[PDB]
């Protein structure tokens, strides 16, 4: 079970899932993610990087970029080490698109609640956000999407085609389900999420435990 990830984290006295564990957990609920592998050795990092295809990104994995070949990656591995580790994350490249935030929080009154908004300044600065209490219906997901002021950024504008609204609705509904079913999850942040004319991809995921 994917719940083994949560149990393992709890057993290790951790308050959060590591980056790769979070993506695995999100993936098992049917939410698409950028492909990743956890490298425990240089031989594994090279092995995995070549496996999923270039270019890849490397970042540290510990409770405490733009690589194209094994030759280039061998440098980055040691560079990252130099610049108490669980390992190094090898991440697939994410083509640019329209950025989204899908959140999950727990309200004292209403319990698990889903948050939606567009990325960059629109959430971070303008706080242009919508909320729906989980579990989410299709009607809940659609309406909360149409509700935000920056909605029009999803329906086509200068130099950007319309994105897959259905894919977004689908992810929102599944985010709600994660919150309803997993009591030990206090908070979840899918940010950034990239919307394309077809499908979406969670690039970064944060899950907090309680």
């Amino acid at each position: 079970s994917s719940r083994d990830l949560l149990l393992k984290a709890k057993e290790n006295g951790r308050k959060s899932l590591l980056e790769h564990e979070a993506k695995y957990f999100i993936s098992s609920y049917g939410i698409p993610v950028t492909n990743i592998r956890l490298a425990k050795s240089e031989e594994e990092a090279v092995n995995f990087s070549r496996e999923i295809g270039f270019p890849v990104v490397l970042k540290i994995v510990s409770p405490q970029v733009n690589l194209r070949s094994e030759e280039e990656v061998r440098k980055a591995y040691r560079e990252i080490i130099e610049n108490e580790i669980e390992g190094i994350l090898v991440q697939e490249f994410a083509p640019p698109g329209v950025e989204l935030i899908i959140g999950l929080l727990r309200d004292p009154q209403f319990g698990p609640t889903v948050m939606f908004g567009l990325g960059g300044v629109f959430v971070e600065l303008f706080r242009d956000v919508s909320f729906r209490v989980a579990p989410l219906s299709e009607q809940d997901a659609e309406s909360m999407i149409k509700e935000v002021k920056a909605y029009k950024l999803l329906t086509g504008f200068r130099g950007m085609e319309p994105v897959d609204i259905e894919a977004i609705k689908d992810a929102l509904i599944r985010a709600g389900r994660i919150g309803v079913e997993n009591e030990e999850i206090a908070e979840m942040d899918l940010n950034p999420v990239i919307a394309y004319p077809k499908g979406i991809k969670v690039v970064d995921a944060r899950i907090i435990l309680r």
Binding site: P108, Q109, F131, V133, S137, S143
Partner: protein, 458 residues
């Protein structure tokens, strides 16, 4: 199950006295004057009789199964009375008495509830002004002695404003099925009451003054409110609907404004920002069916009111469309050539009284008309009461039930005419904006209903 709370066979009043200024005494008085047909048992240590009724020193001494005990004794005596009521098998304890959680005595309030539950007894309040149920001729409050009879159930978390609004319903001609003060909500709350009013055939509309919901109660609130919304409109006046006000009402923790709003939307609930809006909407929803479609007609003897109406409807996401050609033909039988038919239909200020009858009738009968707002500006060529009578006659002869609101502007004669119409349970208001806002509420509810239906789809 609150059947025995609203329709009890026997009610005990604890705290009544020879002193008519005591809260219990006021409650007892209201109970008798309002015509409660069950048994009333005043409880008092000394008095052998109060208001001509045999008095007892304790509820347990009452030779009868008491359904409801209205407790108005000092807080340091409440628990003692609870034990007695429990021993006597009282099912509901209505704790008028204040001085609990709202003054920082959380321990006393929690003890009150647990001790009540140990006997299988439910608690209303504490810190409330009581409750009223018209179908059972039951006025167990120390508020006004009387209310107009109707299908509106009003739930209030606030005391002073609640008891004042109880009186205000009379002035605004709102027919009441029930008034319920819930105060501290230590036990029985909005969820429980909504569950009862859902099943109540006497209640058609539910108005709630809400400060906040108890932690962990929100999901159930949405589940119950949604199903209720399918058949009965719910209007909420939210206390602390701004960030600043939310903190003020917290004097446990400031609840999320944005999440409360979302919760209301998912429940199909209409949020009113003011008492006036809440009452104006309640009136219309109480006296009209929901529009079965979007073909709304506005009728006016002047473009000015019609424009105010258009702007007001527009602010509510309601847009007027061309009237059916058949309706235009009907009206053209008597209106001048310089009349507008763009909707609003402007029959000009030259319109005499009878034109309001003919126009209203034509509109209501037309199969392609779903709703009608009738606007009137007083002129010397008309009488306000004559116009009102014409509208009444038109609605009757129409022989159908389509939503209607009325806006009348003018002097004292208009004030009288509006009053006449409202006493006919025809939603009438002294300005075009309020008439159109009221009609907007009807459409808001139709759309809210649709939201909930779609959300519950298989």
């Amino acid at each position: 199950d609150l059947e025995r709370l609203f329709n009890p066979s026997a009610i005990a009043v604890v705290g009544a006295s020879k002193d008519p200024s005591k809260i219990g005494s006021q409650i007892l008085r209201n109970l008798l004057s309002y015509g409660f047909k069950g048994k009333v048992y005043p409880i008092n240590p000394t008095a052998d009789e109060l208001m001509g009724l045999k008095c007892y020193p304790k509820v347990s001494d009452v030779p009868d199964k008491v359904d409801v005990a209205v407790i108005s004794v000092p807080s340091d005596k409440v628990l003692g009375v609870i034990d007695d009521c429990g021993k006597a098998g009282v099912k509901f304890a209505v704790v008028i008495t204040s001085g609990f959680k709202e003054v920082g005595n959380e321990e006393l309030e929690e003890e009150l509830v647990r001790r009540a539950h140990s006997y299988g007894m439910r608690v209303l309040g504490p810190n409330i002004f009581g409750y009223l149920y018209a179908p059972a001729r039951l006025n167990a409050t120390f508020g006004p002695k009387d209310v107009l009879s109707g299908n509106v159930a009003f739930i209030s978390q606030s005391g002073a404003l609640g008891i004042a609004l109880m009186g205000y319903t009379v002035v605004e001609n709102i027919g009441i099925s029930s008034i319920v003060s819930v105060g501290n909500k230590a036990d029985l709350d909005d969820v429980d009451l909504l569950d009862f009013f859902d099943k109540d055939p006497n209640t058609g509309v539910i108005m709630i003054y809400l400060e906040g919901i108890a932690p962990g109660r929100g999901r159930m609130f949405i589940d119950v409110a949604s199903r209720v919304s399918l058949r009965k409109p719910i209007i909420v006046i939210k206390a602390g609907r701004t960030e600043v006000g939310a903190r003020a009402a917290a004097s446990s923790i400031a609840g999320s404004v944005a999440i409360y709003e979302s919760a209301f939307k998912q429940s199909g609930i209409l949020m009113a920002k003011s008492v006036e809006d809440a009452f104006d909407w309640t009136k219309a929803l109480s006296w009209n069916p929901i529009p079965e479609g979007e073909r709304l007609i506005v009728l006016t003897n002047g473009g000015g009111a019609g424009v105010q109406s258009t702007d007001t409807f527009a602010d509510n996401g309601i847009y007027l469309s061309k009237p059916p050609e058949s309706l235009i033909q009907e009206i053209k039988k008597f209106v001048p050539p310089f009349a507008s038919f763009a909707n609003p239909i402007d029959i000009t200020g030259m319109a005499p009284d009878d034109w309001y009858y003919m126009g209203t009738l034509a509109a209501l009968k037309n199969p392609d008309v779903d709703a009608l707002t009738v606007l009137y500006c007083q002129t010397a060529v008309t009488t306000p009461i004559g116009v009102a009578k014409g509208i009444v006659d038109a609605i009757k002869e129409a022989g159908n039930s389509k939503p209607v609101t009325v806006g009348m502007v003018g002097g004292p004669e208009v004030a009288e005419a509006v009053s006449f119409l409202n006493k006919q349970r025809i939603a009438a208001y002294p300005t075009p904006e309020r008439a159109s806002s009221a009609m907007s509420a009807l459409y808001a509810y139709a759309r809210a209903r649709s939201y909930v239906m779609k959300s519950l789809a298989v």
